[PDB]
Design a protein around this ligand. Structure first.
Ligand SMILES: [Cl-]
Length: 359
């Protein structure tokens, strides 16, 4: 989007202390929660921001550490927030890894010591519950078959099915062969009971990493980072438990050989749903963050050419729809890494600003 409503650095560090953004919109409060990892143990920080209607700007409040989102002796990473519309409760899923090499790792280099955790809030994110280790309940037997894993980063998904199911995007490094290095593959964790029980979905294609999911029958579309020149996408008709054959989305470039995390969300069509996605647009560098639109999701061929949101160094990003903007079109919030990881920038713009040809 050429013109934007707001562009503000919400996290800054010449030492690259802030990375891995996660954004969550609270529709009732009309506020945003911006999460990020803070490095030197590694912790998750947060800044609350209220959408001020009179000025149509988000007023960001002081930064605070999410003290509860951590396990003793562990580093916290990959903030993955979710708003449960049925209860109003907020979930912050995250990963916890020992701060130093453990005795177990000393004997078995690839031993899994990564933990899946969560903290919840019933007061719009002002205070959080003590951490809950979901590892055993969500992963189970497969745990020892991986070297490590992660969720998100970025916002999770809640479906519009009867149960208002929760879907948490993830990926795991599978220890498929003793000599070969572990291979990552994306998948989803699924809960039909607001996080009481969890099911682990089947993996999508091999060599897929950080991913996010959106809903558009109702299908869950998973958009993942790859080591190829294009994004990998797959759709599921059973809430993410099983995905149809993965596809390469040539219209969405991925800078080889490492690729970069990107974000995707669905939003009500301005005419079903459309998809909005953000990711760097350079063919081989993490640069020039762009916004892409898919008016006939999840068809890979329907993705639009990107509109430049920010020129220069840009990496990870996270999107959130924020209701209706001042001009009458869908409002969006985007948190992204910029300037060689020296900052995390917040951008707010509308669909009309980003894709004027639509109006
Ligand atoms: Cl709310």
């Amino acid at each position: 989007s050429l013109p934007v409503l707001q562009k503000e650095s919400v996290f800054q560090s010449g030492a690259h202390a802030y990375r891995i953004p996660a954004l969550l919109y609270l529709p009732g409060q009309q506020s945003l929660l911006a999460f990020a990892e803070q490095r030197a143990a590694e912790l998750i920080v947060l800044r609350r921001g209220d959408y001020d209607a009179p000025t149509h700007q988000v007023q960001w409040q002081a930064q605070e550490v999410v003290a509860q989102a951590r396990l003793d002796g562990h580093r916290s990473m990959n903030p993955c927030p979710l708003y449960d519309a049925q209860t109003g409760t907020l979930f912050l899923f995250f990963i916890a890894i020992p701060g130093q090499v453990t005795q177990q790792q000393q004997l078995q280099t690839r031993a899994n010591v990564t933990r899946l955790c969560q903290v919840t809030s019933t007061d719009h994110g002002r205070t959080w519950s003590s951490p809950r280790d979901l590892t055993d309940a969500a992963i189970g037997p497969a745990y020892r078959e991986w070297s490590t894993f992660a969720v998100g980063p970025g916002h999770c998904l809640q479906l519009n099915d009867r149960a208002r199911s929760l879907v948490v995007p993830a990926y795991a490094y599978r220890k498929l062969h003793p000599i070969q290095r572990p291979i990552p593959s994306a998948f989803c964790f699924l809960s039909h009971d607001h996080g009481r029980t969890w099911a682990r979905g089947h993996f999508v294609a091999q060599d897929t990493l950080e991913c996010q999911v959106a809903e558009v029958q109702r299908v869950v579309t998973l958009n993942a980072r790859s080591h190829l020149r294009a994004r990998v996408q797959a759709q599921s008709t059973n809430d993410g438990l099983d995905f149809q054959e993965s596809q390469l989305v040539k219209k969405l470039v991925e800078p080889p050989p490492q690729g970069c995390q990107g974000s995707v969300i669905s939003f009500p069509s301005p005419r079903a749903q459309w998809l909005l996605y953000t990711h760097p647009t350079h063919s081989w560098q993490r640069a020039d963050l762009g916004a892409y639109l898919n008016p006939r999701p999840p068809a890979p061929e329907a993705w639009s050419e990107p509109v430049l949101l920010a020129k220069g160094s840009c990496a990870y990003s996270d999107l959130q729809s924020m209701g209706t903007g001042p001009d009458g079109s869908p409002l969006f919030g985007c948190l992204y890494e910029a300037n060689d990881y020296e900052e995390i920038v917040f951008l707010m713009f509308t669909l009309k600003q980003a894709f004027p040809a639509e109006y």
